[PDB]
Paper text:
Second, we incubated SETD3 with actin peptide in the presence of a molar excess of SAM (at pH 8.0) and crystallized the post-reactive product complex, i.e., the methylated histidine and SAH. The methyl group at the N3 position of methylhistidine is 3.2 Å away from the sulfur atom of SAH, where the transferable methyl group was attached before the reaction, and makes three weak C–H•••O hydrogen bonds, respectively, with the main chain carbonyl oxygen atoms of Thr252 and Asp274 as well as the hydroxyl oxygen of Tyr312. The methylated imidazole ring is perpendicular to the aromatic ring of Tyr312, and the nitrogen atom N1 is within H-bond distance from the side chain of Asn255. The current configuration of Asn255 appears to serve as a proton acceptor from the protonated N1 (N1–H•••O=C) of methylated H73; and to donate two protons to the main chain carbonyl oxygen atom of Ala268, and to a water molecule (numbered w2). The water (w2), in turn, forms three additional H-bonds with the main chain amide nitrogen atom of Ile270, one of the side chain carboxylate oxygen atoms of Asp274, and the main chain carbonyl oxygen atom of Arg253. This suggests that immediately after methyl transfer, the methylated histidine is positively charged with a protonated N1 (N1-H) and a methylated N3 (N3-CH3) and forms a cation–π interaction with Tyr312.
On the substrate-binding surface, the residues are diverse, reflecting the fact that the three enzymes act on three very distinct substrates—the large subunit of Rubisco by LSMT, RelA subunit of nuclear factor NFκB by SETD6, and actin by SETD3—with limited sequence similarity immediately surrounding the methylation target. Most (if not all) SAM-dependent MTases use the classic SN2 reaction mechanism, which requires the target nitrogen be in a deprotonated state.
Numbering used by the authors:
A (entry chain A): 19 to 501
B (entry chain Y): 66 to 80
């Protein structure tokens, strides 16, 4: 287990992960190639460089005491290992909705600025990737403090999980379920980026003199980096700075033990007291788990970045890339109409599962995408031109009945085309989830690919319904609603 | 309202 062999592997790994994209048709092979190199490095290393003797629950009392000494709320809840979500907070008393039950002063947080003033400071001021990417800076901040026995944040670090359910921890066959989906490319990117980052910083630590005082200089395993970046991506937060002029990334102890449920964001930052504050999202009776609303993220973002799949996600969505073709003879006019509306000529839009299926920006694009030349002129010339552009994102004011029929006909055909690019059908995915016994990580992948097709299927039906509604208004010569 | 709403686990760019 010579260090020179590991240096040769990280050098091979860095160059492999620094190569350009091999084309979307060879991304799976590249992924497997990178996996093989990573697993060979991981098999030659000793896992996490720092492990703690006690189990996770043994260190929660020290977290409460540590957080109490620095002004945080520690009464009214307890840590419980729930089966569905893992460890979380459970109310020991009745908590009414909108009650301020949880607050964490800034002194407890781990932030980019706390990383600047730590042992990582010297290396931070020289490496561009650390300066430009605060999430990576927080990840190394967490690693350096983890390997420091007398760190101020040890009570928080000793309570963190030792493993996560991000795709970085998935088996090869669990990721294979995602083949031919939209989400698997982000899984590829996450894995390639993490592998490139580890090898890059492994060599940076070994060559920069201002990293010699780091504990990572003596031990920095791939397991360390995967755990660190998984800790940050599943728990990081955006808070304002002390003066309130700039925003920064932060890890918020104690409060980040809350699991996710549907609702509204009830967590903010109070600058007057300089502390994170969280009011109860709903009534929490004693003995009930305390939840918060993480945000309006899709199940793909929850799986890839948060490490879980949320059933009945009201904000689920899929991507759909659309653009005006340069072969279109009306390209110049369409591009100008889109530019005056603040919409690019080509972009990635979203199809939502909750009505409406498309946003105002996507509706405005599809209207211009299907405009005739004479309709485009009325959006470019005259005293009413800007007024017409102002209503492009409004469903109540169409350009014309024919324009609506054409844009909903296109969306139905495109959504039907996207469904035909998946390896399996919706009925096949449901059969797998029903007849096979799967792991949590495998279920996440299969539910993820199922959710994509179900959003596309609902977009197909909603577009067909809208097509028939506006065709009725056109066959009956309905008066066009004016604003 | 919340002057600084905190989205937990906000997605950041790793590229
Ligand atoms: N609704 C939910 N269902 C399942 N797991 C969830 C969840 N909300 C949060 N989690 C889990 O909690 C993580 C965020 S941190 C929340 C506390 C965490 N359970 C812990 O033991 O530290 C996620 O990455 C996921 O592992």
């Amino acid at each position: 287990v010579s260090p020179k062999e590991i240096l040769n592997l990280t050098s091979e790994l860095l160059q492999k992960c620094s190569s350009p994209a091999p084309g979307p048709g060879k991304e799976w092979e590249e992924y497997v190639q990178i996996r093989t190199l990573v697993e060979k490095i991981r098999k030659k290393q000793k896992g996490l460089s720092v492990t703690f003797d006690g189990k996770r629950e043994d260190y929660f009392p020290d977290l409460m005491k540590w957080a109490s000494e620095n002004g945080a709320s520690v009464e009214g809840f307890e840590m419980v290992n729930f089966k569905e979500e893992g460890f979380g907070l459970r109310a020991t008393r009745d908590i009414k909705a909108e009650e301020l039950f949880l607050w964490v002063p800034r002194k407890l947080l781990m932030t980019v600025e706390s990383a600047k003033n730590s042992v990582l400071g010297p290396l931070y001021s020289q490496d561009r990737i650390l300066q430009a990417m605060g999430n990576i800076a927080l990840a190394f901040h967490l690693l350096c403090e983890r390997a420091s026995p007398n760190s101020f944040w040890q009570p928080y670090i000793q309570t963190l999980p030792s493993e996560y359910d991000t795709p970085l921890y998935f088996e090869e066959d669990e990721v294979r379920y995602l083949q031919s989906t939209q989400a698997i490319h982000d899984v590829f990117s996450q894995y390639k980026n993490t592998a490139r980052q580890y090898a890059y910083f492994y060599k940076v630590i070994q060559t920069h003199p201002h990293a010699n005082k780091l504990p990572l200089k003596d031990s920095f395993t791939y397991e360390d980096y995967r755990w660190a970046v998984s800790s940050v991506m599943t728990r990081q937060n955006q808070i304002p700075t002390e003066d309130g002029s700039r925003v920064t990334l932060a890890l918020i102890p104690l409060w980040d033990m809350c699991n996710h449920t549907n609702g509204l964001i009830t967590t903010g930052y109070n600058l007057e007291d300089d502390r994170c504050e969280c009011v109860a999202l709903q009534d929490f009776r004693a003995g009930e788990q305390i939840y918060i609303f993480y945000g309006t993220r899709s199940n793909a973002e929850f799986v890839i970045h948060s490490g879980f799949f949320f059933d009945n996600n009201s904000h689920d969505r899929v991507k759909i890339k659309l653009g005006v073709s340069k072969s279109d003879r009306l390209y110049a006019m369409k591009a100008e109409v889109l530019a005056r509306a603040g919409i690019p000529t080509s972009s990635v839009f979203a199809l939502h599962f909750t009505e409406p299926p498309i946003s105002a920006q996507l509706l405005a694009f599809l209207r211009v995408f299907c405009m005739t030349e004479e309709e485009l002129k009325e959006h470019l010339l005259g005293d009413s031109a800007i007024d017409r552009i102002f209503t492009l994102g409004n469903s109540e004011f169409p350009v014309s009945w024919d324009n609506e029929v054409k844009l909903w006909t296109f969306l139905e055909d495109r959504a039907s085309l996207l469904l035909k690019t998946y390896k399996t059908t919706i009925e096949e995915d449901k059969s797998v989830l029903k007849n096979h016994d799967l792991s949590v990580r495998a279920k996440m992948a299969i539910k993820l690919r199922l959710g994509e097709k179900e959003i596309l299927e609902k977009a197909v039906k909603s577009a067909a319904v809208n097509r028939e509604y506006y065709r009725q208004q056109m066959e009956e010569k309905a008066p066009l609603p004016k604003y | 309202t919340l002057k600084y709403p905190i989205e937990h686990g906000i997605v950041t760019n790793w590229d």
